[PDB]
Ligand SMILES: [C-]#N
């Protein structure tokens with residue numbers, strides 16, 4: 087059950103819903119997009135292919151919604167697609183990226199797109215669907231370059247550098263230049279900013295046999311104003327953590343480290359018990375509903391079969407679970423009233 091869908095389908099879905107990107111298997115070009123309606127507990131799978139008649143490509147990595155348009159990063163296809171969020175039809179695309187990762191909008195005419203296998207962050211004009219410039223990251227090359235997730239702090243964007251890197255970088259958006267850096271443990275995976283302007287990042291520890299490193303990974307709380315580590319929470323060699331995520335008021339942190347972990351951002355210590363216990367599968371993506379705190383956990387299972395998403399209440403009770411595509415890795419909320427918080 088994948089592609090025998092016939093003619094293009096005309097979708098008209100709920101004003102409120104949840105996109106799930108599915109990476110597919112790297113180099114097989116079987117990435118897909120799913121759309122879940124939390125009010126009816128119904129999922130639609132392969133919706134980009136069904137609406138457009140052609141496939142997304144290889145490693146759908148992330149997605150952002152802005153002003154009615156969803157922007158889907160297809161990491162191993164050199165492309166970002168822009169789709170209508172109600173019909174899933176393509177409205178445009180930007181090609182020419184080395185290996186794009188995440189998108190951060192500064193205006194209708196300016197966004198940053200991070201990359202792997204490149205030392206540059208690409209600057210785009212989303213209104214004209216063009217690459218307009220580059221930010222050169224210091225002490226990075228094409229052979230092992232990596233920039234990943236982004237958060238904004240005033241006029242600055244902070245970005246974690248993931249694969250074969252060990253830094254958070256600070257970008258002045260007024261000049262499009264890196265102006266500072268912070269070295270931490272190897273391979274920070276993700277980055278969020280809490281309501282107290284503390285950034286959180288968690289590293290993956292590298293891997294056995296890596297030319298760059300293999301070490302016990304850590305979660306870090308970093309002060310954004312002074313760009314300094316406040317506390318390092320070190321885990322165990324052989325753990326491979328990922329994906330810090332916040333709730334909608336940016337006061338409760340979740341992440342993946344076999345189990346799903348949860349901590350108030352004010353806490354001194356990680357709780358003894360996780361939010362969701364490891365079950366001998368592969369928890370791989372994570373999000374929190376910004377309005378009601380429900381926690382969604384994407385499980386790749388074994389990286390081969392169809393993955394599943396679990397939907398839990400903020401108190402840890404299962405609400406629903408639904409099968410998606412292969413290696414579901416990221417989420418994007420479609421909310422009727424745009425949620426922001428400070
Ligand atoms: C692969 N990380």
Ligand SMILES: [Cl-]
Nearest residue numbers: 119132134135
């Ligand atoms: Cl699809």
